[PDB]
Amino acid sequence: PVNRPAVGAAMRLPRRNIASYKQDGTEIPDKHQAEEHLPLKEKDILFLDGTLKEQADKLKKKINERYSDVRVITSKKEEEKYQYQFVRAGYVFTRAEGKDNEKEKTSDGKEFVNRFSYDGFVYYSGERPSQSLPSAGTVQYSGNWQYMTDAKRHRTGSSTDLGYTTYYGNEIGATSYEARDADDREKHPAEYTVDFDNKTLNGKLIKNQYVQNKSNPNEPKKPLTIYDITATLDGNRFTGSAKVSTEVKTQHADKEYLFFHTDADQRLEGGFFGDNGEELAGRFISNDNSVFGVFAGKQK
Amino acid sequence: PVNRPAVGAAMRLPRRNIASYKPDKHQAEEHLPLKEKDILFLDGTLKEQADKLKKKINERYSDVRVITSKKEEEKYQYQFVRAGYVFTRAEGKDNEKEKTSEFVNRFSYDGFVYYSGERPSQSLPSAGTVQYSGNWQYMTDAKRHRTGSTDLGYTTYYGNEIGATSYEARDADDREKHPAEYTVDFDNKTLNGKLIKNQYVNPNEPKKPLTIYDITATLDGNRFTGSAKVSTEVKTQHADKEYLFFHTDADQRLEGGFFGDNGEELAGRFISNDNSVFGVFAGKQK
Known part of the structure; x- marks a missing residue:
């Protein structure tokens, strides 16, 4: 997990719950939101395989599974400089313009879940693990x-x-x-x-x-x-x-x-x-x- | 900044770069003056202010012995002010280094001197x-x-x-x-x-x-x-x-x-x- 050998790994954008009510409609005490800190989790490290293109395609696919109609930006322009043959250290993301935040609400209409609609990954990929060094x-x-x-x-x-x-x-x-x-x-x-x-x-x-x-x-x-x-x-x-x-x-x-x-x-x-x-x-x-x-x- | 009013201020120990790699037996930094921008302004209670300084030391080294001015300042029995210090000798710790492929070498010691004040006088x-x-x-x-x-x-x-x-x-x-x-x-x-x-x-x-x-x-x-x-x-x-x-x-x-x-x-x-x-x-x- 932390130690897993891999030919690719990715982490998805964390989105914390900025809601300021509980599910029973009661205010969260002391001006706080529901989730003021969201650490990453090792379980959420997404392990990848296949070619460089396949791996990138899988991550873009995941973005579109959440919203089919958002535009994706990639690191392809950024990584041009390096002319990598076998590896990538990149990103794919969306600003999800025109998308409402993810919400869940009470009968009276109070938000007890509110998460941004943004999305993205950072990742590395590798092809042809070395047979000789x-x-x-x-x-x-x-x-x-x-x-x-x-x-x-x-x-x-x-x-x-x-x-x-x-x-x-x-x-x-x-x-x-x-x-x-x-x-x-x-x-x-x-x-x-x-x-x-x-x-x-x-x-x-x-x-x-x-x-x-x-x-x-x-x-x-x-x-x-x-x-x-x-x-x-x-x-x-x-x-x-x-x-x-x-x-x-x-x-x-x-x-x-x-x-x-x-x-x-x-x-x-x-x-x-x-x-x-x-x-x-x-x-x-x-x-x-x-x-x-x-x-x-x-x-x- | 140099003239900014404050209820607390501190200066961190300067540690010059003694590295001798990138001539004439010189080190990278033979003089390190202080900087007015490095004046660290503090607020909150006397305790809060001191704790912030101890925290910064611990952020560099989680496991070092920290020495304070507590014993020294007892005699004064200050109610509202402090003029103190907090530091570590960082026993057993390596110097801060950046390396050859040493062009940076700074001492492992650390510390602050500071003043703190609570309840600025509303009448004099x-x-x-x-x-x-x-x-x-x-x-x-x-x-x-x-x-x-x-x-x-x-x-x-x-x-x-x-x-x-x-x-x-x-x-x-x-x-x-x-x-x-x-x-x-x-x-x-x-x-x-x-x-x-x-x-x-x-x-x-x-x-x-x-x-x-x-x-x-x-x-x-x-x-x-x-x-x-x-x-x-x-x-x-x-x-x-x-x-x-x-x-x-x-x-x-x-x-x-x-x-x-x-x-x-x-x-x-x-x-x-x-x-x-x-x-x-x-x-x-x-």
């Missing part, structure tokens, strides 16, 4: 990552103030595809070093921070490491941890830390794809189920 | 002069070379790889390391004071105070704004030690206020002009 040497990979967070009403004592499209992070999970305060040139790069001598992987899941000069395409990037990855290789898999960088904790306590605050200890799993480990991909989920992340990489 | 005397006594704390920049840590009166590393602090002062009188004295003129609407170090020297053994800062401020409502100035004594007679830490004034960068019914107590903060020292202070009517 280098017996020696160190190899650099570069790529990207995506993420899906819990839904939480109060992260501190708006969602846009915190760098996300309105509501994301609060009434529904925060996602990489709704991050507004990142460098849209490349919001979420990732870097990895694989030591095939000692059989270790180290990496960084990075956010390129927002830059004021948006007219110069060669404006320098402002990287911020969100997670340090460490892992051990075993066959064509690797297992390890994602740890929130100290820098996030101390210098970004009022923003990034409100979303990325707990490690994923021994809760990161991935593997190599392409017959000779040309690429890699995987996932992690933090100890308190506050973030599900997926990541991918390609040899430099 | 319209006249008369009032004496206050209390204490202060401080946090300095981190600087590899202050001259051409133990010789300079601090626990190892403090002042160099991390900021020097009042709670790592080793050359002071343990009876009361950092007393403060104030006089408030409610006629002329002024505050004058001294932030002092009792130098190392029986409970009635004479003290050897050394004024570190002279404080001046003007009153406005239940607040006061002014300056902290390095003492004549430090600059001229302690050029080879204290002056290496206390060398620049805080001009119009000291802020505090009165707390309690009729200004029984006062507290505040200052930050020197070149961001070399952040100080906090508290006092109680004599």
Whole structure:
């Protein structure tokens, strides 16, 4: 589950109950809504198989099973940069315009269930698990990552103030595809070093921070490491941890830390794809189920 | 921000980057001044404010021993104010690192100095002069070379790889390391004071105070704004030690206020002009 080897995994957008009445029509006490915090669940990690296209199609299918007539946006445009052959770290989602929220109401018309109609997944996919890996040497990979967070009403004592499209992070999970305060040139790069001598992987899941000069395409990037990855290789898999960088904790306590605050200890799993480990991909989920992340990489 | 009114403020320990990889035997960051933006403003009860600081430490390390200013501040029996600290030596913890493919290396220690106040005074005397006594704390920049840590009166590393602090002062009188004295003129609407170090020297053994800062401020409502100035004594007679830490004034960068019914107590903060020292202070009517 946390440890399951896979050729694909996904997490669906969590949508918390923002209703302020109970099913008996009585007010929820102390100004509270029915569900002010909705963590992710490991049981909700959706495991995938088949080709890259089949896996993506399955997730889009799931979106349309809920609403047949909503438009879907994908990460196809975002992942162009990487020219991945065997892996994906992507997303598929909808804003569900013109759809009412999911509601359940009393006879008198009071809402005791109210959930947003938004929907989406972040996921990784891999094809052709490696049959051979280098017996020696160190190899650099570069790529990207995506993420899906819990839904939480109060992260501190708006969602846009915190760098996300309105509501994301609060009434529904925060996602990489709704991050507004990142460098849209490349919001979420990732870097990895694989030591095939000692059989270790180290990496960084990075956010390129927002830059004021948006007219110069060669404006320098402002990287911020969100997670340090460490892992051990075993066959064509690797297992390890994602740890929130100290820098996030101390210098970004009022923003990034409100979303990325707990490690994923021994809760990161991935593997190599392409017959000779040309690429890699995987996932992690933090100890308190506050973030599900997926990541991918390609040899430099 | 530097001039923002507050009922509590804290500064976190600066930890400079001592990494020596990406020339001339230099480290990545040989001087780390403080920043006015890193002044952490606090609110809520005295307890709430302190707990927030302990929380931030625990957010970095869930399992470290935390040391507080509780024992030190007992003597003052403050009702409404605090000038304290919370810190950890982070025993057995690795430094903060980012790596080769080390271009970042920052110490594992952590801590804050802070002031806190509850119930800002809604009335003050319209006249008369009032004496206050209390204490202060401080946090300095981190600087590899202050001259051409133990010789300079601090626990190892403090002042160099991390900021020097009042709670790592080793050359002071343990009876009361950092007393403060104030006089408030409610006629002329002024505050004058001294932030002092009792130098190392029986409970009635004479003290050897050394004024570190002279404080001046003007009153406005239940607040006061002014300056902290390095003492004549430090600059001229302690050029080879204290002056290496206390060398620049805080001009119009000291802020505090009165707390309690009729200004029984006062507290505040200052930050020197070149961001070399952040100080906090508290006092109680004599």
